Design an enzyme around this catalytic site. Structure first.
Site, PDB file in Angstrom:
ATOM      1  N   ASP A  56       4.204  -3.989   5.341  1.00 55.97           N
ATOM      2  CA  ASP A  56       4.995  -2.859   4.879  1.00 55.97           C
ATOM      3  C   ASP A  56       4.352  -1.515   5.260  1.00 55.97           C
ATOM      4  OD1 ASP A  56       7.203  -1.518   3.732  1.00 55.97           O
ATOM      5  OD2 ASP A  56       6.431  -1.811   1.686  1.00 55.97           O
TER       6      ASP A  56
ATOM      7  N   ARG B  51       6.076   6.249   3.599  1.00 53.73           N
ATOM      8  CA  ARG B  51       6.086   6.270   2.122  1.00 53.73           C
ATOM      9  C   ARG B  51       4.825   5.639   1.508  1.00 53.73           C
ATOM     10  NH1 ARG B  51       9.778   2.532   3.740  1.00 53.73           N
ATOM     11  NH2 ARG B  51       8.923   0.455   3.357  1.00 53.73           N
ATOM     12  N   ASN B  52       4.187   4.725   2.262  1.00 46.93           N
ATOM     13  CA  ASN B  52       2.964   4.016   1.900  1.00 46.93           C
ATOM     14  C   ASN B  52       1.704   4.593   2.483  1.00 46.93           C
ATOM     15  OD1 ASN B  52       4.220   2.063   0.346  1.00 46.93           O
ATOM     16  ND2 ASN B  52       4.826   0.882   2.185  1.00 46.93           N
TER      17      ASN B  52
ATOM     18  N   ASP C   8      -1.044   2.032   0.228  1.00 49.19           N
ATOM     19  CA  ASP C   8      -0.493   0.977  -0.585  1.00 49.19           C
ATOM     20  C   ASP C   8      -0.341  -0.236   0.316  1.00 49.19           C
ATOM     21  OD1 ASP C   8       0.686   0.213  -3.174  1.00 49.19           O
ATOM     22  OD2 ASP C   8       2.547   0.106  -2.025  1.00 49.19           O
TER      23      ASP C   8
END
Ligand SMILES: Nc1c(N2CCN(C3CCCCC3)CC2)cc(Nc2ccc(C(=O)O)cc2)c2c1C(=O)c1ccccc1C2=O
Ligand SMILES: Nc1c(N2CCN(C3CCCCC3)CC2)cc(Nc2ccc(C(=O)O)cc2)c2c1C(=O)c1ccccc1C2=O
Lengths: 258, 272
Positions: A138, A142-143, A156
């Site tokens: 992922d 955003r991470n 993350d």
């Protein structure tokens, strides 16, 4: 060996956001290295906490350990002042408006050097992960998180079909090569100031594009040599994709004299 | 009371997207009016009861700017809801697809690649307002008005479509006023506030409200009475309408009849 922190040391200041599995707070933490600012997640997890104590690199958000004296359960990381990369990109960007941190990074577009510095930094973290044969699954802006001085770190670990390659969507094959593909998409996000891949299309239409071999548009920003790196990441066959070490090399080459 | 369709009459063509509801398909439907193309929602997952109640409501709400609901199919599974095909899809991705550096993938022969005329934008806003007028007429509260919940058909016709944007019992907080956030109060005035945010989305080519911020920070802005930036697009006269919708006090907000009237005037004689 997870560093355990005492509660009396952690004083919460204000809430930063609410992620997948609970609240995130800014806090003063005392006696952790004097008193400094850290980011504290809230409400098994010990598997994840061990993983984060395992994964140290310049471009992975510093994990300072846990508090499991009382409840709820705390995970303590460094405060990354500017927050997540996606919203930071967007905050700069054509018709955006910056709401804070302009004294650190100027209002307005970031321009080629700074965007290449962002890409490089993410890639550096991905090189580290490939080194340990660790698959992210992922990778996405955003991470990533963005701290003081425009330093960027993978933020993350753990659906996100628009960042996945066909073998991951069709077969659920996640490898270091599927992470490279996602990193190509991250390059696209950076160079579009944080647009969603296939923003034009429904989830189903975007799966259909990806699987039929359609390539994300070249961004208006994008130099041809940067778009070339994306296409390096997006070869239909996993075997044929550039290594992440090659990709980091190329990016760090461009970042000096863009 | 609900029009039932036979399943043999509905033939699926291809999938368009997947919502919370379940999949949505393009289909031919026979014996519906004097064979034509429709959108079929397919219920995933009881939610049997959520379906009959929703279906009754949609039979109830007939207007030029509410997606035509043609009825349901309840022989064979899954359970189907049948609506008119709105070719360009939802307004949010339509907007974004027409953003200043965006890239149209289809339907260019109907609406040109690139940003829309000021009159085009105002015509989209006033269509959505017309739907909201109809709803406020019925004392009906939408609760989630937003561009993603509007659909865009052939010739730039826009209709209310539905009845990360959400925050966990899922609240679209970036579209909500303070009294909705703090006290769970949903009124025709809270829908006006949301309408204002929809105008902001229109005039930003589909940006998220408070894009700079987390959910929590956005709630703090909204409850502390901070206003969304004026878009670079936005004429003063349009941004004024937005602020009219965004008064801290519900009492003080423009009526949706006010807002429609004013927008219909601007669409007829667009500023600068
Ligand atoms: N700094 C944040 C942060 N923000 C504080 C920065 N805030 C500023 C940025 C400057 C302009 C706008 C306001 C953006 C949100 C939100 C944060 N959480 C978010 C961000 C976005 C969403 C969302 O999309 O709603 C949710 C939570 C975090 C962090 C971390 O530093 C952090 C560090 C380590 C682990 C986790 C975090 C973290 O989660
Ligand atoms: N037309 C669509 C539609 N599209 C069909 C074609 N598509 C693009 C093709 C790319 C540029 C022009 C428009 C956009 C999406 C998605 C549609 N559903 C979506 C839209 C977006 C998502 C998503 O964001 O993942 C999912 C489903 C619909 C419809 C309807 O017409 C419709 C009509 C009545 C009720 C519901 C719908 C409907 O749901």
């Amino acid at each position: 060996s997870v560093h355990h922190i005492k509660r009396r040391d952690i004083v919460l200041k204000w809430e930063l956001g609410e992620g997948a599995f609970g609240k995130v707070f800014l806090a003063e933490c005392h006696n952790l290295l004097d008193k400094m600012l850290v980011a504290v997640k809230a409400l098994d997890f010990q598997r994840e906490a061990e993983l984060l104590t395992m994964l140290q690199h310049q471009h992975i958000v510093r994990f300072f350990g846990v508090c499991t004296e009382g409840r709820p359960l705390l995970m303590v990381f460094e405060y990354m002042r500017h927050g997540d990369l996606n919203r930071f990109l967007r905050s700069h960007g054509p018709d955006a408006k910056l709401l804070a941190g302009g004294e650190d990074v100027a209002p307005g577009p970031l321009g080629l050097g700074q965007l290449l510095a962002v890409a490089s930094q993410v890639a550096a973290g991905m090189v580290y992960l490939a080194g340990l044969h660790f698959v992210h699954r992922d990778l996405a802006t955003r991470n990533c998180l963005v701290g003081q001085g425009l330093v960027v770190k993978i933020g993350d670990f753990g659906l996100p079909i628009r960042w996945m390659p066909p073998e991951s969507i069709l077969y659920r094959k996640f490898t270091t090569e599927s992470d490279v593909w996602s990193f190509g998409v991250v390059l696209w996000e950076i160079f579009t100031y944080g647009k969603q891949p296939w923003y034009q299309l429904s989830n189903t239409e975007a799966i259909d594009c990806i699987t039929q071999g359609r390539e994300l548009e070249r961004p208006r920003a994008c130099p041809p040599e940067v778009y070339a790196i994306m296409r390096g990441c997006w070869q239909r066959e996993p075997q044929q994709r550039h290594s992440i070490k090659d990709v980091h090399a190329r990016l760090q080459a461009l970042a000096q004299a863009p």
